[PDB]
Every structure is written in C-alpha cells, then in structure tokens.
Design a protein around this motif. Structure first.
Motif, short mmCIF file in Angstrom:
data_model
loop_
_atom_site.label_atom_id
_atom_site.label_comp_id
_atom_site.label_asym_id
_atom_site.label_seq_id
_atom_site.Cartn_x
_atom_site.Cartn_y
_atom_site.Cartn_z
N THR A 2 42.89 61.31 61.65
CA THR A 2 43.52 60.87 60.41
C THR A 2 44.39 59.64 60.63
OG1 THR A 2 44.71 61.62 58.45
CG2 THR A 2 45.63 62.24 60.56
N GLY A 3 44.85 59.41 61.86
CA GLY A 3 45.52 58.16 62.17
C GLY A 3 44.56 56.98 62.12
N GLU A 4 43.35 57.17 62.65
CA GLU A 4 42.35 56.10 62.61
C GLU A 4 41.75 55.94 61.22
OE1 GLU A 4 42.53 54.69 65.94
OE2 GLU A 4 44.02 56.23 65.46
N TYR A 5 41.62 57.04 60.47
CA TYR A 5 41.03 56.94 59.13
C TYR A 5 41.92 56.14 58.19
CZ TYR A 5 39.28 58.29 54.54
OH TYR A 5 38.81 58.27 53.25
N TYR A 6 43.23 56.34 58.28
CA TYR A 6 44.18 55.57 57.48
C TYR A 6 44.65 54.30 58.16
CZ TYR A 6 44.57 59.02 53.77
OH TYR A 6 44.31 59.84 52.70
N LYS A 7 44.28 54.07 59.42
CA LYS A 7 44.45 52.73 59.98
C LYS A 7 43.43 51.77 59.40
CE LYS A 7 43.17 51.86 64.22
NZ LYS A 7 42.26 50.69 64.05
N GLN A 8 42.19 52.23 59.23
CA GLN A 8 41.17 51.41 58.59
C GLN A 8 41.37 51.38 57.08
OE1 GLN A 8 38.45 52.49 56.59
NE2 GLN A 8 37.02 50.76 56.71
N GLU A 9 41.82 52.49 56.50
CA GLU A 9 42.05 52.54 55.05
C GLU A 9 43.16 51.59 54.63
OE1 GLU A 9 40.20 54.12 52.90
OE2 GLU A 9 41.39 53.57 51.14
N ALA A 10 44.26 51.57 55.38
CA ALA A 10 45.36 50.66 55.06
C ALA A 10 44.94 49.21 55.24
CB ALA A 10 46.58 50.99 55.93
N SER A 11 44.16 48.92 56.29
CA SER A 11 43.65 47.57 56.47
C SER A 11 42.67 47.19 55.37
CB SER A 11 43.00 47.43 57.85
OG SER A 11 43.86 47.88 58.87
N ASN A 12 41.89 48.15 54.88
CA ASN A 12 40.93 47.87 53.82
C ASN A 12 41.60 47.60 52.48
OD1 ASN A 12 39.60 49.76 51.44
ND2 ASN A 12 38.15 48.25 52.27
N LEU A 13 42.70 48.29 52.18
CA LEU A 13 43.32 48.15 50.86
C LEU A 13 44.01 46.80 50.70
CD1 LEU A 13 44.79 51.74 50.36
CD2 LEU A 13 42.75 50.75 49.30
N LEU A 14 44.60 46.27 51.77
CA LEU A 14 45.31 45.00 51.65
C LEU A 14 44.36 43.84 51.41
CD1 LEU A 14 45.09 43.22 54.61
CD2 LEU A 14 46.56 45.11 55.33
N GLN A 15 43.14 43.93 51.94
CA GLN A 15 42.17 42.85 51.78
C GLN A 15 41.69 42.72 50.34
OE1 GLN A 15 39.53 44.20 54.90
NE2 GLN A 15 41.31 43.90 56.24
N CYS A 19 50.35 43.00 47.22
CA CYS A 19 51.43 43.93 47.55
C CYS A 19 51.98 44.63 46.32
CB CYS A 19 52.55 43.17 48.27
SG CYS A 19 53.92 44.20 48.84
N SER A 20 51.84 44.03 45.14
CA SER A 20 52.37 44.65 43.93
C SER A 20 51.62 45.93 43.59
CB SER A 20 52.30 43.66 42.76
OG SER A 20 53.10 42.51 43.02
N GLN A 21 50.29 45.88 43.59
CA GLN A 21 49.48 47.06 43.33
C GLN A 21 49.12 47.83 44.59
OE1 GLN A 21 45.88 45.77 41.42
NE2 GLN A 21 45.23 44.48 43.14
N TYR A 22 49.48 47.31 45.77
CA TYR A 22 49.30 48.07 47.00
C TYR A 22 50.21 49.30 47.03
CZ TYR A 22 49.09 49.01 52.06
OH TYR A 22 48.94 49.59 53.29
N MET A 23 51.36 49.22 46.36
CA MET A 23 52.29 50.34 46.35
C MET A 23 51.70 51.55 45.64
SD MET A 23 54.78 49.12 48.03
CE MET A 23 55.28 47.49 48.56
N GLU A 24 51.06 51.33 44.49
CA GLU A 24 50.49 52.44 43.74
C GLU A 24 49.29 53.05 44.46
OE1 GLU A 24 49.59 50.96 39.87
OE2 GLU A 24 51.69 50.87 39.23
#
Length: 213
Positions: A2-15, A19-24
């Motif tokens: 789950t650390g690796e799954y949300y390491k890629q997930e967090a990197s995927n969302l920013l692309q 940052c304004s809608q990244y919070m939601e």
C-alpha cells in the motif's frame, strides 16, 4: 504494497490535477481508505495504514504542497485551505511551514490596514483596523481551520509586529495612538456612544493593547 500503490497513485494524481483540486482527490482517498480499512483489516492496523497512506501520498510531495501554499493564504480560499491544513497536520514536518507562512500574511495584510493613516483621525482608525484584521483572522482560524494554538500564536506574533511597527530611526507609533484612543473615547465632549457601547469598544481595545511591546 500500500506504500507503493499510493506512491504511484500520488505521482499519478499530480500529473493530471493541480494543487487546488489535488486536495479533494487526496481527501477523497483517505475518506474512502478509512472506510475500506475498517471493512477488511484488524482495528490495530487502522492508524498504521493511514500513516502509510499519508507518508507516501501527502508527505511524499511535501515540497509540492509548500510550493503552492503561497497562493492559498493570499486569496483567503476557505475550501482550498481547510483541505490544505488537514493534509499537513498529519505530516510531522509539514505543518510548521504553513504557520510561519501564514504568519507573514497577517504581517503583510496588517501593515496595509495601518498604512493610510489619516492626519485627522489617527487613534480610532489604528484600533479599528486592527479589529478588522483581528476580527477576521480569528474567524478564519476558527471557521475552516481547527482551534489550533499554533495558528493562534502565529496570529498573535504577527499582530504584535504590525502594532509595534518602528519607523527607521524613529520610535514606534503604537503607545500614543492607543493612549489617545482611550481619551478620545472617555470624554463627554460632543455626542458619546453611551456606556452600554463604551464598555464594548474598550473591551475590544484590550486586544490591541495586549500586543503592545
């Protein structure tokens, strides 16, 4: 995993999202993660999973959060800052950058209030402008943020600097204007505000006087 799954997930969302809608989107995951964690896992892992769902999702882009945190506080964005606060409060070293940067916002907005000092109504405007700054920034710390003493100490420290403003090679203008404000208010000259309101203005004067060095 789950650390690796949300390491890629967090990197995927920013692309894809700023940052304004990244919070939601992050809070759209932690709110759902807290539900799916209590449907499957043991209750002992509830705090360890989320601590991993923020270390690799919120603390991972710590500099990205602090890069875009400048524009959030300037515009008094209610929704984009409350969501910004709840992300940093979990991270150990993320929150103190926000309170120091928010401390500069009062120190910048406060000076603009006490800058157009009229040459005929100096004492009333100085106190009233502080109450405009204080009566609003206390609300912001209390209506979208929690009652955090770190932000309250930042507001107290920031309001101290603007009140105790010293001109170059000159004394601070605070003591006499607050002294003149009381005498301009305790006189019976012209038409007064009556003691039912005098006791209210003087109570609000204590907040200004509390920050006097």
């Amino acid at each position: 995993e789950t650390g690796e799954y949300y390491k890629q997930e967090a990197s995927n969302l920013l692309q894809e999202s700023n940052c304004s809608q990244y919070m939601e989107k992050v809070l759209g995951r932690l709110k759902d993660e807290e539900i799916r964690c209590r449907k499957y896992l043991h209750p002992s892992s509830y705090t360890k999973v989320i601590h991993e769902c923020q270390q690799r999702m919120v603390a991972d882009h710590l500099q990205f959060l602090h890069a875009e945190c400048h524009n959030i506080i300037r515009q008094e964005k209610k929704n984009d800052m409350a969501n910004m606060y709840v992300l940093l409060r979990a991270v150990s070293t993320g929150l103190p950058h926000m309170i120091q940067e928010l401390q500069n916002h009062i120190h910048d907005e406060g000076l603009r209030a006490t800058s157009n000092l009229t040459q005929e109504n100096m004492p009333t405007l100085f106190v009233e402008s502080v109450l405009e700054v204080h009566g609003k920034f206390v609300q912001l710390i209390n209506t979208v943020l929690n009652g955090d003493q770190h932000f309250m100490s930042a507001l107290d420290k920031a309001l101290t600097s603007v009140v105790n403003y010293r001109e170059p090679k000159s004394v601070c203008k605070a003591p006499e204007l607050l002294a003149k404000y009381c005498d301009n208010l305790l006189k019976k000259s012209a038409k007064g505000m009556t003691e039912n309101e005098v006791e209210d203005r003087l109570t609000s004067f204590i907040t200004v006087f509390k920050y006097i060095d």
